């Protein structure tokens with residue numbers, strides 16, 4: 159899976175997108191693109207989450223854990239995983255904006271731990287990051303179709 163490198167590479171890019179300096183290339187690039195797609199499609203949620211976080215060093219973990227628990231409460235799908243990356247992105251960007259840059263390493267650790275300890279089994283059972291890339295390439299009708307075909311498979 160190489161979940162930790164995916165995290166670091168992702169955060170390093172969202173922080174470049176904002177101006178600061180901090181597994182196949184296709185996985186990295188596809189995750190970036192999917193993330194930008196999610197943030198455009200769910201632009202109200204993105205902006206509102208940004209506004210409603212109140213990051214301090216003392217509340218960062220509670221904030222992270224609350225949101226991630228809510229995100230995966232009813233189960234996992236690839237879009238929720240993308241929302242998780244985007245959420246982590248937001249936390250990192252606002253950490254730096256607010257001159258709390260120490261949190262960035264913390265958030266990256268929390269994200270890698272969550273992927274390894276709570277998303278790893280799902281990812282493996284759902285075809286790995288290869289199936290993520292495959293789905294991204296498919297149009298919505300194709301994606302719904304391979305979902306029902308994968309269910310009927312195993």
Ligand SMILES: CC1(C)CCC(c2ccc(Cl)cc2)=C(CN2CCN(c3ccc(C(=O)NS(=O)(=O)c4ccc(N[C@H](CCN5CCOCC5)CSc5ccccc5)c(S(=O)(=O)C(F)(F)F)c4)cc3)CC2)C1
Nearest residue numbers: 192195196203207228235236237238241245290293294296
């Ligand atoms: C409880 C709480 C407060 C918790 C906190 C929180 C929250 C708030 C702010 C922030 Cl910041 C973070 C979290 C919320 C907000 N909630 C979070 C969850 N939300 C989701 C909404 C939709 C889905 C979904 O749809 N999931 S999905 O069915 O699995 C799926 C479908 C399509 C594709 N991708 C296609 C790609 C199309 N191709 C492109 C290339 O040319 C060919 C066509 C469309 S783009 C695309 C479309 C959707 C997602 C990503 C990319 C992918 S995907 O990109 O991951 C892939 F395909 F799998 F790779 C997967 C999952 C969850 C709704 C908003 C709620």
